[PDB]
């Protein structure tokens, strides 16, 4: 694909509409994700575009390099990512990212993978404890999406 | 990938589960829907994993070849067009097709689009008239789900 999209949905007040795009080498991410709590919001790829269980079965970050997590300006990161989303008070976070690391095509296509957003501020790996380097301790998944090509 | 997965939701009772494996030059799908009349009804992958819009905003059914409508058993076919899924008294359908055009990898990849539902059978093209040609007549889209990469 050369056009990405993502419809995220779970069990609570939390959606949104993300947008993918290969401009140049890169993907640009846009979109928002509304009835948030103000703050950040830990936003990845996550392995597998299975939505049987719920968001669970999306599975770990995409991680083709098998690294510790990060964020998504350090070296030791997975490739899904992101880092977060910051939803202001009325709830919506406006999503403005443009990465390095995952694709629409070939090895670090995220293409049929799903993109979630989380309860609570991924730390970046930087928290000190084992999960920090899983997850950043962004704890829940509020909605989720598989990640499909679009028009 | 090697295993897909979608999960179709719609705005119905109609739902479903849909697993595909690549085996040999194939895609074996299984899996089931529930909620169906009894009978055939229409199921295909249509173009985009787009549900901004529901299950319309998935397009027209998988088309790379520029083909009329047909049956998955005849050369003219869309790449989607996995014919009818015949659903019990009980309102069960139970999948089990192998296909080979659709593909979980490549050009007729079928990751990242939509698995669709329909409210009819599909004549497989052989309706006589020209929405056979183009839909087989299988009517509206009951459910759908963007294909995702499994485990
Ligand atoms: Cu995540
Ligand atoms: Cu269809
Ligand atoms: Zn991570
Ligand atoms: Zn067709």
Chains 1, 2 share one sequence.
Request: proline share 4%.
């Amino acid at each position: 694909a050369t056009k990405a999209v993502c419809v995220l949905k779970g069990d609570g007040p939390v959606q949104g509409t993300i947008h993918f795009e290969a401009k140049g080498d890169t993907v640009v991410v846009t979109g928002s994700i509304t009835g948030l709590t103000e703050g950040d919001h830990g936003f990845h790829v996550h392995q597998f575009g299975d939505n049987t269980q719920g968001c669970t079965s999306a599975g770990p970050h995409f991680n083709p390099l098998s690294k510790k997590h990060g964020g998504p300006k350090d070296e030791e990161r997975h490739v899904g990512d992101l880092g977060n989303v910051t939803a202001d008070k009325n709830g919506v976070a406006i999503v403005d990212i443009v990465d390095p690391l995952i694709s629409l095509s070939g090895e670090y296509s995220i293409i049929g993978r799903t993109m979630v957003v989380h309860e609570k501020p991924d730390d970046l790996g930087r928290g000190g404890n084992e999960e920090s380097t899983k997850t950043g301790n962004a704890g829940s998944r509020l909605a989720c999406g598989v990640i499909g090509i679009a028009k």
